[PDB]
């Protein structure tokens, strides 16, 4: 579902990390279980950065979304990361939006800003993104 490549973004989100769900699909928070495309190493915890697809679970939300495994995409993170043009930036919170393998967004709205890395990687997120940072 993703289009194009992504540069190095220091993955600040670990396994069992709770992130907000800026999507409007009745889900409040998501805790990361795995990371799609992660290459395993001994004793290493899966890592997620901006624009990274993850497999998460909902421990708080509506009954049709709670206690189930979803497939979110990280749109912003509190970890400071550096762009290739020498820009160092970091958001105020960790957030994600629920998508699927094809990439089509489940919801229709996003609250707050969306990082550039997740916007260009997933075209459907960019259309619903209010502002792209």
């Amino acid at each position: 579902g993703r289009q194009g490549n992504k540069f190095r973004v220091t993955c600040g989100l670990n396994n069992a990390s709770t992130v907000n769900c800026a999507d409007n699909t009745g889900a409040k928070t998501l805790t990361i279980i795995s990371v799609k495309g992660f290459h395993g190493r001994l004793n290493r915890l899966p890592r997620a950065g901006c624009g990274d697809m993850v497999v998460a679970t909902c421990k708080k939300g509506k009954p049709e979304y709670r206690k189930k495994m979803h497939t979110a995409v990280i749109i912003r993170q509190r970890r400071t990361w550096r762009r290739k043009d020498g820009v160092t930036l970091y958001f105020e919170d960790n957030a994600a939006v629920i998508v699927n393998m094809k990439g089509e967004m489940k919801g229709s709205a996003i609250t707050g800003p969306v990082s550039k890395e997740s916007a260009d990687l997933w075209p459907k997120i960019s259309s619903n993104a209010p502002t792209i940072v």
Binding site: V87, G112, P113
Partner: protein
Amino acid sequence: QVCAFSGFKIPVAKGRKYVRLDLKSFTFINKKSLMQFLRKTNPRKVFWTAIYRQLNK
């Protein structure tokens, strides 16, 4: 780029950017200014700030 708190001219490849939830982003020059910005300190009351040096003299 100009620092949000100190108002100093930010050199290239220096400083940090803070993106708030209200869709407003500020780029700072050092952790000295960023910490004072997060405490809601008034740059008009901080003597070494460029903003303070414009209001007076």
